[model samples]
Target: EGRFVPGTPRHGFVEGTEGALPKQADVVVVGAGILGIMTAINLVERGLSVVIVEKGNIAGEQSSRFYGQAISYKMPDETFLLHHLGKHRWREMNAKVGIDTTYRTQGRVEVPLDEEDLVNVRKWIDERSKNVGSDIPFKTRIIEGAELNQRLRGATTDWKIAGFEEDSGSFDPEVATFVMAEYAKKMGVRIYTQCAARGLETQAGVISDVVTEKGAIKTSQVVVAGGVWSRLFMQNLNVDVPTLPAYQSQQLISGSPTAPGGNVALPGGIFFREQADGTYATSPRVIVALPDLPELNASLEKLKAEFPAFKESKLIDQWSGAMAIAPDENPIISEVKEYPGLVINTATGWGMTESPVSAELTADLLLGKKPVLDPKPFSLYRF
Candidate 1:
């Protein structure tokens, strides 16, 4: 809806104390959010010099405002593995990086509000256990009624079946970006903030350079992670990148909102655990985001039956951010055919978890190697 975070920018940008943008780079990544920085890190790890051109500050968009669920539950066949890989990478980064991302692996809970939801959750557990998880790897299972209730924290609590994943968790995106950008710096990736890429330069049907507001940077490949601005940026090349800016809004409830706040996920919305400081981060996964006050009122009404305190609690922080979702409701990560070297990377609002996966996949494509998962399903051709 609108500004819920008081006494701060709608969202804070990542401070840029790094070096300036290079005149030339092996790859140019537009947008310095989670996707951009993580893609840069992966490219550098694969021996490609990267320069990230960010129009604004890092993690200032959906990255910082995301629901922060580093989870892989109830995904389709094409994306489950990527979520799996992303969770692993996040854990690895948390262990190695100096900056603390508040990456917690305490696991996650999915509450199916109705009977059908319970069945759907059961299906995910069974499907995941059989196809993805197996008895061998980490698996999410359905928690029966009583145990599910025991794990919940809010006043309104009661679900017949709940899905629980031991490996699922979340992290602070702003701090995570800081960590990733620092790691990328160590790996020799340069970043430039407030430098907008106006268009691309093509030479004989291939990408030659990126024309930015600051200056043009000659490079063979370009990765556009401009997010909601991705389609507009690509339009200069006469490319059709079908994406819609679906706004996502969240409210940080303070002063002891309700129980069942412990990583609860439902069909209508999602709620994170109450912080040590006693704040709850909740997002109403609406089909289309409404105005700030209506969004807040809708949430209060939704949780009123379960947690009356939620209806009464003070809103410490709220944010309405944009998530670029393609028509099919999946992410697009591919290179344009007409403009051969131009790679396009956009996440369907889950970039927080998909950043590392997209990086590995896109880097593999750029390097002419086999990606961990078949990129065909997530290709732009899917549209």
Candidate 2:
């Protein structure tokens, strides 16, 4: 076993002590994770007074726990531009908020286990369809042989490095989420921490108000940016949003590796990000083949087998969280037909990377403005 390490999936919520709960706002956003915070910021920018109701502290659950890799290969056909837009959006947010997000353009590579894996990954990169202009420059390329060895130095790669994404990187998710909530508040959005939203009250098939532990907030618009709990939340209103939970968790090693590393995706499902101070955040890149043992144990054994440089690294803190995935592995970012004024935004496993443009689209949808991307593939009723 990789030793049973336990902790909350992300940073603990630090509640804001003094924000007055309003009787009403132009929009009420449920859940203060990435989706909620970004959506609230977008609404407020459009001149709407927004109120956010969070069950716990900002990013208390899964928002802060992510792979931090902007190295997306195969994305849903409709959302291929998400990662491209997200990379730049994170930089933009950090610049405006003055938060040190550690947005490195260090680049990342995926070591394909077999030729089949390489072909599929290449198809995903090539068939991305329409071109979208980006202020940020990111490129996807095929690499091999001596060049790959030069990049990885002396590491053992049981799987060959098939390709890489340039201008890719990692950031401090805990810091980003926390600072984003703080920045939203500074922009005049009201966030109620430790505040649980019970359910929605409807009148004549339209969302009339948001009922919460604190009080009722009457609003014409409601964005359920709720992550995993979104399924249950919608089900309570007898509305079904097709989503299942897929757990993506990780362990943090105490110190730097003998050799500080590459943001690598290996064949045996080993993937890790190297921080500036030297600790590594690790997780599995694929499903575990060993059904009898824990996934972490299987993954850890593969890690040690493939990279001897990590043999000396000590385990530090661990974190895990569930991602609410749709049936197609795409996100649903449309207003519910049954509930007229409600908008739903939930992703499979790529929420962190997709948050920026997702929120931008949600705001545009709510305001009846033209969408930045096509809306058909991710609409709520696609199933």
Candidate 3:
């Protein structure tokens, strides 16, 4: 039963880049999460020297531990557009890295449990549909009757209506992170694992160096993507990032009958999606306030009731992870005005869904290039 444990480092599974740390780099990225690695890749491609330092293994934290949903159905307008960009980036990234990320555009389905939910769904659909028409029109609509039954594949929930996104899909988070790490190394970005960044050093009110437990790296710019630890790390620099931590439990199951092709988010906090392999990854609705196993199990039981095929499903692995939530529920992706050479990128709960475009904009801001998306909305000054 001890096959997996939450809050444990995953360095043993992934191969690390073994070597001495670099003495200097044009940019030093803290944390080996998707955002950090992707940012390093973008910078290195522009002929800038980059180094990445990870306190644990590659994606050992929240990056590897996630239910990968690439859809942008429920977000503010700006973030929705940025997240939609990630859908294409995921496919492009897999090809660029020459690795099988197992990403698919199999689509996603959601069923409302009550009248109130249906009303909210209608409002969201109206707003999002208008947004899509202005940008790129795609298959996001409401389905019912035969279409609903066909999409659910013999589910007996008798749902009256459901939200369907024909282009929404998911990928393997751990595999994606590992492949990106390998590609970063191929692009001449030095990555150091088990290297804890202690603090940032400044000269003339600008970042000059990053002091780690092992040694110091001389760099003109530093990007912090430390996830939940970001707030604590920034505290050392007196940045004071306003973020709250929330616990989430996720598990994998196999031997279940074939379901739909993509993600499914049923009412009552039941979320499950097909994986690359035959197994299915299941979790409660988005964020679980507490690390409560009993509540998690209750959601699984509800799934079994709605879809009897899942009754015989056996658990393969289960673990808990924390999600960093911003007060406004939007990611903070702006430079610390107080710390000129230091930028903070955190509160991005769905790294696989949002980090791609976020990393690109982060690189643009750091390099003074024109950003694809406006950055003022994400600035920390609002807080």
Cα-based lDDT for every prediction: 0.72, 0.73, 0.78
Query: CA shift at 238, candidate 2, in angstroms?
Result: 2.0
Q: Which ten residues in a row have the lowest lDDT in candidate 3?
A: 3-12
lDDT for model 2, on a 0 to 1 scale? 0.73
Residue-level lDDT tens digits of model 3 in 1-383: 23233343222245556777888999999998888988889889889999989898877888777877788776677587777787767757667877666677768888877889788878988877665733555567888888777778857666678888878868765466766777888998888888999998888887888999888989889999898999899888877889998887788877455555467878767788887765678886654355477877787788888777788888777787887878888888888888777777788776778777888888888877899788987787877
| Clashing residue pairs found in predicted model 1 | 1-292, 4-318, 5-318, 153-259, 153-260, 154-259, 154-260, 155-259, 156-306
| Model 2 stretches astray by more than 4 angstroms | 1-13, 17-19, 129-138, 158-160, 202-206, 286-298
Runs with alpha carbons beyond 4 Å of true place in candidate 3: 1-12, 133-135, 287-291
Cα RMSD for predicted model 3: 3.0
TM-score for each of the candidates:
0.87, 0.88, 0.92
Best by lDDT: 3
lDDT, model 1: 0.72
Question: Which candidate, 2 or 3, would have the higher lDDT against the true structure?
Answer: 3
